[PDB]
Design an enzyme around this catalytic site. Structure first.
Site, mmCIF file in Angstrom:
data_model
loop_
_atom_site.group_PDB
_atom_site.id
_atom_site.type_symbol
_atom_site.label_atom_id
_atom_site.label_comp_id
_atom_site.label_asym_id
_atom_site.label_seq_id
_atom_site.Cartn_x
_atom_site.Cartn_y
_atom_site.Cartn_z
ATOM 1 N N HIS A 40 0.808 -1.216 0.000
ATOM 2 C CA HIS A 40 0.000 0.000 0.000
ATOM 3 C C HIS A 40 0.849 1.277 0.000
ATOM 4 O O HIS A 40 0.319 2.384 -0.045
ATOM 5 C CB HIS A 40 -1.048 -0.017 1.139
ATOM 6 C CG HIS A 40 -0.566 0.518 2.461
ATOM 7 N ND1 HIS A 40 -0.172 -0.298 3.503
ATOM 8 C CD2 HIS A 40 -0.517 1.783 2.944
ATOM 9 C CE1 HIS A 40 0.092 0.438 4.567
ATOM 10 N NE2 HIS A 40 -0.111 1.705 4.255
ATOM 11 N N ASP A 84 -0.168 -7.503 1.805
ATOM 12 C CA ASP A 84 0.362 -6.152 1.806
ATOM 13 C C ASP A 84 1.881 -6.203 1.969
ATOM 14 O O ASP A 84 2.417 -5.935 3.042
ATOM 15 C CB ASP A 84 -0.270 -5.353 2.939
ATOM 16 C CG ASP A 84 -0.057 -3.861 2.795
ATOM 17 O OD1 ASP A 84 0.341 -3.414 1.708
ATOM 18 O OD2 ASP A 84 -0.298 -3.130 3.773
ATOM 19 N N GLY A 175 2.381 6.753 8.575
ATOM 20 C CA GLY A 175 3.765 7.128 8.363
ATOM 21 C C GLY A 175 4.708 6.010 8.744
ATOM 22 O O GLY A 175 5.856 5.989 8.306
ATOM 23 N N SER A 177 3.815 2.819 8.205
ATOM 24 C CA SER A 177 3.522 1.783 7.215
ATOM 25 C C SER A 177 4.740 1.357 6.412
ATOM 26 O O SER A 177 5.557 2.185 6.028
ATOM 27 C CB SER A 177 2.416 2.259 6.274
ATOM 28 O OG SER A 177 1.180 2.320 6.966
ATOM 29 N N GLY A 178 4.870 0.056 6.188
ATOM 30 C CA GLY A 178 6.004 -0.461 5.443
ATOM 31 C C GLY A 178 7.215 -0.714 6.326
ATOM 32 O O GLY A 178 8.152 -1.397 5.914
#
Ligand code: HEX
Ligand code: CA
Length: 223
Positions: A40, A84, A175, A177-178
């Site tokens: 995402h 994801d 922020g 995320s990942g």
């Protein structure tokens, strides 16, 4: 990160910042040429920033490298966030040292209760907004699948796990995320989603990396 603490400069060497004129997502360096992030977080024109502490100042130790290729998992579903996960190939290999190092892929999945370190430059306010300059850290245990599925009825797939605190106050956020979820020196999860941030009875959900180790290796091997 909500309710976390300042990690300290370069104490999390595998943490990367995905930049497009501003920090939008985190990532984890798995080898000199590949980064693992969330699907995402996909966007064109990504520059991978390694060795970062203060993302708004050049302090030394930084390495800015353009993303050569971003491989989103073919089965990624934007509505459910299942699968994801995304691999990013760097245009040129990073220079590994004390400040910049890769993290290992798990050999086996982690069990409920395993304590992990979550880090990122995401929002530090559950109700409101405040972005930090430096990297924040948070120690969080993996929750049992029963409690996870109870918190998000019918939304948790076999490729997700919950980590955090059911009482709220400490969690990953926008922020982050990942970013990496590291347990016992192994990358066990990727910051994926959650209902708000640091909300009571709403832990963070993460991509279960152990389910993708073979996919990662095969994809990297053929690219
Ligand atoms: C940010 C420098 C130009 C490429 C995108 C960061
Ligand atoms: Ca910097």
């Amino acid at each position: 990160i909500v309710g976390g603490y300042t990690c300290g400069a370069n104490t999390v060497p595998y943490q990367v910042s995905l930049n497009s004129g501003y920090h939008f997502c985190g990532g984890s360096l798995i080898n000199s040429q590949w980064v693992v992030s969330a699907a995402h977080c996909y966007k064109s024109g990504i520059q991978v920033r390694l060795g970062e502490d203060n993302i708004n100042v050049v302090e030394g130790n930084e390495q800015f490298i353009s993303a050569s290729k971003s491989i989103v998992h073919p089965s990624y579903n934007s509505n459910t966030l299942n699968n994801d996960i995304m691999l990013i190939k760097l245009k040129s290999a990073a220079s590994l040292n004390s400040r910049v190092a890769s993290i290992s892929l798990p050999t086996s999945c982690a069990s409920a209760g395993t304590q992990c370190l979550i880090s990122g430059w995401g929002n530090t306010k559950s109700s409101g907004t405040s972005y930090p300059d430096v990297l924040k850290c948070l120690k969080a245990p993996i929750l049992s699948d029963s409690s996870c599925k109870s918190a998000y009825p019918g939304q948790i797939t076999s490729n997700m796990f919950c980590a955090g605190y059911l009482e709220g106050g400490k969690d990953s956020c926008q922020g982050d995320s990942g970013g990496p979820v590291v347990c016992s020196g192994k990358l066990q999860g990727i910051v994926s989603w959650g209902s708000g941030c640091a909300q009571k009875n709403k832990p963070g959900v993460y991509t279960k990396v152990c389910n993708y180790v073979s996919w990662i290796k095969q994809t990297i091997a053929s690219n």
